């Protein structure tokens, strides 16, 4: 892929974060805290899962960013509609406004309904996410493996502005405390 030149500087939106998340001063790193992080509730916060959005909203053009997932056991990454459900239980699917991949229990899967098995030979330490708004495309790249394609959602029906989407995952195991980090351009 030669998508690097559509690179955008993503920052995390504290107001959307689940109340257990800890976001760094530069708004580029997020991890699961061991308790409630002493913030007020609001209608934006994801209540049920350790999720947060980027502050940027995209309604046109081509956008590319990279995320570090080093030593995590579980995470979700991709984009979502600005209008996605925040409260209660929901599944990650394009019908619910999400275009995502994840690691869970030693397998990688794309967030279709039902979910799709991914075939990755080199476990990624950094993921590239490419959005072409006009083409209706979301693609995922394995930066550890020289940029090899992971998955492409095509014929996407975005149906509104898009936000970068993150889930640090739970840490029931004690092996998933590590942060997600937005990588420098």
Interacting residue with ligand RV4 among 53, 74, 156, 162 (CB under 6 A): 74
What is the four-CA torsion angle of 46, 102, 20, 23, rounded to 10 degrees? -100
Please provide the size of the chain in residues: 185
Chain-centroid distance of CA 153 in Å reads: 14
- Determine if 169 is a binding residue for ligand RV4 (CB under 6 A): yes
Tracing tokens 């279709």 back to the chain, one arrives at 112
| Residue 73 C-beta: closest distance to ligand RV4, Å | 8
Tracing tokens 């490419």 back to the chain, one arrives at 130
Spatial strand order in the sheet of 51-53: 51-53, 162-167, 75-81, 98-104, 107-110, 116-117
| Residue 49 C-beta: closest distance to ligand RV4, Å | 7
- Determine if 47 is a binding residue for ligand RV4 (CB under 6 A): no
Rank residues 101 and 131 by Cβ distance to ligand RV4 and give the closer one. 101
d(CA 5, CA 17): 29
- Determine if 175 is a binding residue for ligand RV4 (CB under 6 A): no
- Determine if 16 is a binding residue for ligand RV4 (CB under 6 A): no
Piece of the chain touching ligand RV4 by CB under 6 A; list 18-26, 37-45, 69-77, 150-158: 69-77
Rank residues 108 and 133 by Cβ distance to ligand RV4 and give the closer one. 108
Residues 117 and 109 sit within 8 Å (Cβ to Cβ): yes
Residues 83-142 binding ligand RV4 (CB under 6 A) are 92, 102, 104
Interacting residue with ligand RV4 among 18, 139, 142, 167 (CB under 6 A): 167
d(CA 136, CA 132): 6
- Determine if 54 is a binding residue for ligand RV4 (CB under 6 A): no
Rank residues 109 and 132 by Cβ distance to ligand RV4 and give the closer one. 109
| Residue 164 C-beta: closest distance to ligand RV4, Å | 16
d(CA 177, CA 174): 7
């Amino acid at each position: 892929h030669h998508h690097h030149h559509h690179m955008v500087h993503i920052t995390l939106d504290r107001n959307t974060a689940n109340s257990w998340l800890i976001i760094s001063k530069d708004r580029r790193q997020v991890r699961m805290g061991d308790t409630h992080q002493n913030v007020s509730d609001n209608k934006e916060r994801f209540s049920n899962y350790p999720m947060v959005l980027g502050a940027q909203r995209f309604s046109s053009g081509k956008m590319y960013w990279e995320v570090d997932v080093t030593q995590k056991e579980a995470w979700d990454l991709g984009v979502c509609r600005d209008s996605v459900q925040r409260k209660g239980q929901f599944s990650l699917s394009p019908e619910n406004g999400f275009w995502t991949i994840w690691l869970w229990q030693d397998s990688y899967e794309a967030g279709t309904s039902p979910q799709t098995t991914l075939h990755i030979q080199v476990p990624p330490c950094q993921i590239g996410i490419f959005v072409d708004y006009e083409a209706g495309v979301v693609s995922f790249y394995n930066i550890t493996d020289h940029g090899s394609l992971i998955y492409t959602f095509s014929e996407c029906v975005f149906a509104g502005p898009l936000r970068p989407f993150f889930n640090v995952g739970f840490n029931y195991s004690g092996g998933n405390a590590a942060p997600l980090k937005l990588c420098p351009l």
